[PDB]
Design a binder for this molecule. Structure first.
Ligand SMILES: Nc1ncnc2c1ncn2[C@@H]1O[C@H](COP(=O)(O)OP(=O)(O)O)[C@@H](O)[C@H]1O
Ligand SMILES: Nc1ncnc2c1ncn2[C@@H]1O[C@H](COP(=O)(O)OP(=O)(O)O)[C@@H](O)[C@H]1O
Lengths: 377, 377
């Protein structure tokens, strides 16, 4: 499309957490004005916004007020209900649309969409009752994973089935929610690729990141991912096909499992800037945030070249005190802090990008700081 | 010396122009709060700040207020009364001090300080009346340049004396303001170096940039500067010498003349982030703005490696319509706009950083856009 949102206009963001703040910082460099809607006052994004609307995400009047004063609307918060999404899509300017968001909100719908796009996923079965769970266990065997189809984004919303001894905890889960059961994928590495597609269809792909999770929370992203050139090219190709097939506008994070045998399976999609892309802020020619703004405003996309190898490390509530006390040791480290007040143990408070010519040296730097000893074990 | 301003604290900025705005954006990424004092409501920096104080720079009570709500204060406005800074360094925390600003604000005192350091400047004479102008011309001969000693570029401020035919114009200037006359330096290139020195003494220098001025306004900065390795090394050494001898805390921009025979003359010093350092936002590991914040807060400085060659081009009031009209054509270009509402022909509205593996391809890109046809002549 030809529709361009010029510098000087207002970008409205639904959700005022760190992803909102970082989008807003990127937009401000390019001379955009920012409006944000969020349930809590003084959110991370509001701390950088020109206009703040403090309301619930299901409050259609407030959503309308945001739209009314915005030249383009984007979201960080994903669980926007259909009546609000349709209103925005048809009566405001929401170039991302609602179709992609709706697909990624349900694990079953999501896997179907991926397979229909021609891409591999772990073999899976929908589980809506006990009978279906029984049949699924029979078909897929052990080991397996039962996950709820909606409302993550946790460790509680799933149960790993290694033996018949785990079935009872699984039945409990299938009793409270609609689920999916997936075959256990024996993977070597978890990897992700951020792809960007503008309103006019220009596409850019970021380099493959290797992701290390701990307690179902991201710990580290390592770029370049420590994988063969063949796995890398495959992950990138898969992401590009997804972006095309799903008619992406904006940002898509594609999380994947990579096997020793060089197989890729697609795990999940997030139609927004993602935690596994924060490395781009310091190590790439354009950040995922600068890219997202350009994409929705239909400006030319920037380059995604990796300019230096990087390890991103997450800063949770349990780490913030360690970071501040060790601040004098943060040479070659690039600190981002989100401006959150309460430091809950598993709340994401910031991240640090450790840049180095050698990836193993960056990894060692994080260890030597003794901030993440818990995650390291 | 050991004193550290931790992320989460409030940084106060005197002056709300583009330099304070970019300081503020970089500080926000680290989780700092920002206060700004500016005489005009909704200044570039206010659009990014948590707290805005609209008041004159000589309003001592507003200055005290800024001091009260801030954990550290810095300045962006280069023509601040040094008596205000004398108050701040004694009744608040101004790690930059008042000395450096007082020395660099007046061209004559500036020259004296550069010579005290042992570095070369163009031969110069103080001019307070017509008799002193006459004696200066007699002693220095032609060609020469007469410049006002204090901030008097809004614009004009200088007369180039190629022959006796220019003397009439110089007399006019000599009556209006205190001046110095300097010998014209026959240089092949103008270059600049940005040096950063933290509270605890840590010193970093950015790559040497080659600057192209049109009508005494910066037009392009070229990095790496197209000079010999030996000239780059000398420029870098001179910069460190100045930081050392001027007891620098914060940022110092050093503008220089490089002659055909490998000598460097120091033109002028600016005790702040400088227009010739804006390339660092997209081409270096740390920007001059992030480095300035880390310097005054006494955090470890970031690395200053050039990650990709770059041409920065200024966007003046005369250029902004052309930029907005040609946004479609800005591939490989990284646009920064300062949020100023009124365009005036020569007012600095933004800059664009053009990244390319080949510096000559970047330069051709700027020409092919035809936005700056007036400068290219
Ligand atoms: N089919 C599978 N095979 C092996 N490991 C899996 C499988 N599904 C999930 N996991 C593991 O569980 C973690 C969480 O799974 P995921 O579906 O990403 O849940 P969430 O949405 O909570 O992040 C993943 O990081 C992965 O290590
Ligand atoms: N002594 C000199 N010899 C040759 N060119 C000069 C000399 N002084 C200034 N110039 C030219 O004029 C420009 C403006 O002079 P400068 O002292 O930098 O004024 P300003 O403080 O307004 O930048 C310089 O960037 C340089 O190109």
């Amino acid at each position: 499309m030809t529709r361009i949102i010029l510098p000087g206009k207002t970008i409205g963001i639904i959700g005022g957490g760190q992803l909102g703040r970082m989008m807003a910082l990127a937009a401000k460099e390019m001379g955009y004005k920012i409006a944000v809607l969020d349930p809590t006052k003084n959110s991370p994004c509001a701390q950088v916004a020109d206009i703040e609307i403090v309301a619930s995400y299901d409050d259609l009047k407030a959503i309308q007020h945001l739209a009314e004063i915005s030249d383009v609307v984007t979201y960080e918060f994903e669980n926007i209900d259909y009546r609000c999404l349709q209103w925005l899509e048809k009566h405001a300017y929401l170039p991302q649309g609602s179709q992609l968001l709706s697909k990624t909100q349900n694990r079953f719908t999501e896997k179907n969409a991926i397979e229909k796009a021609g891409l591999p996923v772990a073999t899976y079965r929908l589980v809506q009752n006990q009978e279906q769970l029984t049949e699924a266990i029979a078909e897929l065997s052990y080991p397996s994973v039962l996950k709820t189809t909606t409302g993550g984004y946790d460790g509680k919303g799933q149960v790993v089935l290694r033996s018949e001894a785990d079935v009872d905890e699984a039945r409990k889960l299938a009793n409270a929610a609609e689920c999916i059961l997936e075959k256990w994928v024996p993977f070597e590495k978890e990897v992700s690729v951020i792809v960007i597609r503008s309103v006019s269809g220009e596409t850019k792909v970021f380099p493959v990141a290797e992701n290390i999770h701990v307690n179902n929370i991201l710990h580290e992203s390592i770029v370049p991912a420590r994988i063969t050139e063949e796995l890398s090219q495959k992950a990138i190709a898969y992401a590009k096909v997804l972006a095309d097939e799903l008619e992406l506008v904006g940002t898509l994070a594609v999380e994947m499992f990579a096997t020793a045998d060089g197989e890729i399976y697609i795990n999940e999609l997030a139609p927004r800037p993602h935690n596994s892309g924060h490395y781009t802020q310091d190590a790439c020619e354009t950040s995922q945030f600068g890219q997202h703004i350009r994409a929705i405003c239909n400006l030319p996309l920037g380059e995604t070249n990796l300019l230096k190898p990087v390890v991103m490390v997450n800063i949770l509530g349990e780490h913030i005190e360690g970071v501040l006390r060790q601040v004098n040791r943060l040479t070659g480290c690039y600190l981002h802090l989100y401006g959150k007040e309460e430091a809950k143990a598993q709340r994401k408070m910031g991240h640090v990008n450790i840049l180095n010519d050698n990836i193993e040296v960056a990894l060692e730097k994080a260890k030597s700081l003794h901030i993440w000893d818990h995650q390291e074990q």
